[PDB]
Design a protein around this motif. Structure first.
Motif, PDB file in Angstrom:
ATOM      1  N   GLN A 192       0.794  -1.197   0.000  1.00  0.00           N
ATOM      2  CA  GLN A 192       0.000   0.000   0.000  1.00  0.00           C
ATOM      3  C   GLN A 192       0.845   1.274   0.000  1.00  0.00           C
ATOM      4  OE1 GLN A 192       0.387  -1.984   3.855  1.00  0.00           O
ATOM      5  NE2 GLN A 192      -1.168  -2.523   2.278  1.00  0.00           N
ATOM      6  N   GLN A 193       0.246   2.391  -0.378  1.00  0.00           N
ATOM      7  CA  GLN A 193       0.902   3.686  -0.404  1.00  0.00           C
ATOM      8  C   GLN A 193      -0.056   4.843  -0.142  1.00  0.00           C
ATOM      9  OE1 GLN A 193       1.099   5.762  -4.285  1.00  0.00           O
ATOM     10  NE2 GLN A 193      -0.665   5.822  -2.896  1.00  0.00           N
ATOM     11  N   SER A 194       0.464   5.934   0.412  1.00  0.00           N
ATOM     12  CA  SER A 194      -0.280   7.159   0.537  1.00  0.00           C
ATOM     13  C   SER A 194       0.539   8.275  -0.060  1.00  0.00           C
ATOM     14  CB  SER A 194      -0.607   7.460   1.991  1.00  0.00           C
ATOM     15  OG  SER A 194       0.468   8.126   2.607  1.00  0.00           O
TER      16      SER A 194
ATOM     17  N   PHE B 188       5.171   4.490   1.455  1.00  0.00           N
ATOM     18  CA  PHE B 188       4.947   3.143   1.014  1.00  0.00           C
ATOM     19  C   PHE B 188       5.124   2.170   2.166  1.00  0.00           C
ATOM     20  CE2 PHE B 188       5.114   4.790  -3.235  1.00  0.00           C
ATOM     21  CZ  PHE B 188       6.090   5.773  -3.201  1.00  0.00           C
TER      22      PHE B 188
END
Lengths: 141, 135, 141, 135
Positions: D15-17, D27
């Protein structure tokens, strides 16, 4: 129409009767009752003509019309005039005409009724209207 | 309302023809049909009672209008060139420039289908497209 | 996001439309194009709900998303489904999701996009991965 | 190599923001960063592009690894708990059990500093001591 009415003798009854040998017009006045089978017309004056096949015109306030149908239920109506053409089995009501069946009625200025076709038409004069009501199969007598 | 089907049909017209064999009535000329809380205006109307519960009403008008109160007190109104009401299947079909609304809700299309009991409307397009705006 | 899009009317267009008065669900099918300002969603099916404030779900192969940013540069993306919550200005792409900005892109199984926060998140399913690439400021269009 | 800074950053993660206002990407989950001849593995990575030339990469891992080819064809490799790469100043910092080598050369410490262009490494110790053996 009770099928077979048409093949019955036309019985008329009145107070006075006039017969016009030149022209061939027969008139009846009084409590004129004309019957043919189950057909019954009441008028003040009835004039029968044979153009050329008989034609019967009834005048009343109003002239009434009755006839039993093959199902035991009557057709009734009234108008200022009942034009009945024997040959076509065609009844025309004019003048504040009203015609009634077990499941429907019609109010108008002219109502034609092809009996041996079970078809009715109704018409109105300029500025006036026809009223038709279909009776729900449970408000029928 | 659901009990409209058992109510008498009152029609006004300039003229009418009633075929009582084939249970069909045709009305023409500024026709006004009222049956319970149903009102219909059209130039020509054809009503058919095969046998009233299987009754069918067809209306033809330039706008041709439809109106019926619903059980929840909200009236349905709409117009189209052609209007077809199958009271047996509580089903209305509006064709040609159709419009239908029920108070705050509404729809437009070349053909509107309206299931009265399911309370569900559908709009369809010819060679074109349906289109709405929501705020 | 071009600031002010949110305050624009939501225009939808399709072949068919269904309206479900009990429940309050509006459906659109066909070449469904939903526009709000510079926002544009294309899907095969669009269902709008108002739980309790509108929510718009788009389904396509894939459903596409477009919107101009305040700087004149677009954001584009596609996925099997576009969930757009009007109230939060929050767009969720699921199913082979892809989202693209002028300086970066993201490929994943679910991509959330808070437009009025300029924040994006991406997620992957067990056994899968997210791909992010940052575009050098000279390979940008 | 010197031209790595102008290369795209490819990252894989669970996942990443991405905060595009404050130009920051986070990440997590078996993250693999590759930018030109740079490879980084870590559990969590934070990349910041203030404004790419002023780019900064932070990596957190149990070993957390670093790799980059140098201009003279010798690769630099190392690992630490935390890894910080300032591409603007060609500067890498490895913290917690740091290790770094460039082929035949290498160093170990609680914190390694590595000036990529000057080709100069430095190792520091906490409350402990650095230690090597030369033959």
């Amino acid at each position: 129409a009770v099928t077979g009415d048409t093949d019955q003798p036309i019985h008329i009854e009145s107070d006075q009767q006039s017969l016009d040998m030149q022209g061939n017009v027969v008139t009846f006045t009084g409590n004129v009752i004309v019957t043919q089978g189950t057909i019954k017309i009441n008028a003040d004056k009835v004039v029968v003509t044979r153009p050329g096949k008989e034609v019967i015109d009834g005048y009343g306030k109003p002239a009434t019309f009755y006839q039993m149908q093959d199902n035991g239920k009557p057709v009734e109506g009234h108008a200022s005039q009942m034009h009945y053409e024997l040959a076509k089995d065609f009844v025309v009501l004019t003048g504040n005409a009203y015609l009634q069946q077990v499941d429907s009625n019609i109010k108008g200025d002219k109502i034609t009724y092809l009996v041996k076709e079970q078809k009715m038409q109704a018409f109105s004069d300029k500025g006036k209207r026809v009223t038709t009501v279909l009776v729900p199969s449970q408000l029928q007598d």
